[PDB]
Design a protein that fits this description.
This is part of a larger assembly, with 3 copies of chain A, 2 copies of chain B and 2 copies of chain C. By secondary structure, chain A is mostly helical. Chain A is 64% helix and 0% strand. The termini of chain C are far apart. The chains are: A mainly alpha, B alpha+beta, C little secondary structure. Chains in contact: A-D, A-F, A-G, B-C, B-D, B-E, D-E, D-F, F-G. Chain C: This is Minor tail protein. Chain B: It comes from Mycobacterium phage Bxb1.
Chain lengths: 22, 51, 76, 53, 76, 22, 22
């Protein structure tokens, strides 16, 4: 379901902040 | 302190270790203390009731 | 004229524990102190010792201990 | 017994209680390959900055 | 007391061309049949949230959904 | 569902080695 | 499930044309 891909997308977005900044 | 001369003191030692074992079990399932602070680090509050 | 700094304390850990009808931020001046303890299930007689300073005769504080049961019929 | 250092710790709590700890022992690449793409891009932006000096 | 229950209820359809049907008396040879769902109240979706690791749930919102109405017509 | 995303993640990690050396 | 992941992949491949050229 779309929601399961959306949940894992949101976790990867919060872990990408280890590696990037504005 | 338990008496190591007699079985009654060996049972007290065992029961003391089971009490310590149970107190660790309650600290497994306990949540962190969460606190929110502002710029300048003043405490606003402890957070409880998050999803 | 604002109303007096009358406070409601709710010891429930989820809500703002100390609040005032004046709108004053009385969560400051509490200096990290919180109410921590509940009245446990099947607690009988308790004496609550309050004390007050800077109050006049006829001022009333109150306590509520709201009784919430898992059932309509028993468990006492 | 294989011995190495704890490099990452993760704790998770939900309205069902704790999920416990994720422990990484020794050095491990991000399991999500998108996070391995972000890790290479962080190294590039650092090298790209010094090449500009 | 003794009483026949014979309600006053009249059901009519006006169609998209302005033609009419009496589904109670059946003067066009058409009658409403013995199965109706979706008269009375329309469906509602009620939404709640979990209050963290605590008893119960909190009300968020409610919404009236479309009225899905299921019925038959007897045609003589 | 999560296991299917995990299988596809493992296959992408094996294919990324065309493009990377640690 | 794998069909939904294939659809999500085709949408990202299209959006990546904003940020890439040969």
């Amino acid at each position: 379901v779309d929601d399961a891909i959306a949940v894992k997308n949101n976790e990867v977005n919060k872990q990408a902040l280890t590696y990037t900044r504005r | 302190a338990a008496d190591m001369t007699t079985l009654a003191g060996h049972q007290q030692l065992w029961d003391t270790v089971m009490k310590r074992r149970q107190k660790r079990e309650d600290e497994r399932i306990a949540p962190p203390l969460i606190r929110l602070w502002d710029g300048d680090y003043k405490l606003r509050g402890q957070l409880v009731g998050e999803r | 004229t604002y109303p007096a700094e009358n406070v409601v304390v709710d010891s429930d850990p989820r809500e703002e524990q100390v609040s005032s009808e004046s709108g004053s931020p009385i969560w400051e001046r509490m200096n990290s102190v919180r109410f921590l303890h509940y009245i446990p299930p099947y607690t009988g007689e308790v004496t609550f010792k309050l004390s007050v300073s800077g109050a006049v005769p006829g001022q009333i504080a109150t306590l509520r201990l709201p009784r919430a049961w898992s059932r309509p019929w028993g468990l006492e | 017994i294989f011995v190495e250092r704890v490099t990452k710790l993760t704790y998770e709590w939900t309205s069902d209680g704790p999920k416990g700890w994720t422990i990484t022992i020794g050095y491990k690449e991000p399991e999500d390959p998108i996070l391995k793409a972000f890790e290479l891009i962080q190294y590039i932006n650092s090298n790209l900055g010094q090449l500009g000096i | 007391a003794s009483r026949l229950l014979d309600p006053d209820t009249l059901v009519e359809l006006e169609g998209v061309n302005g033609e009419w049907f009496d589904l109670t008396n059946g003067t066009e040879g058409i009658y409403l049949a013995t199965e109706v769902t979706g008269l009375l109240d329309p469906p509602v979706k009620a939404t709640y949230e979990e209050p963290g690791n605590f008893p119960g749930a909190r009300y968020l919102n409610h919404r009236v959904l479309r009225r899905d109405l299921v019925f038959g017509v007897e045609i003589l």
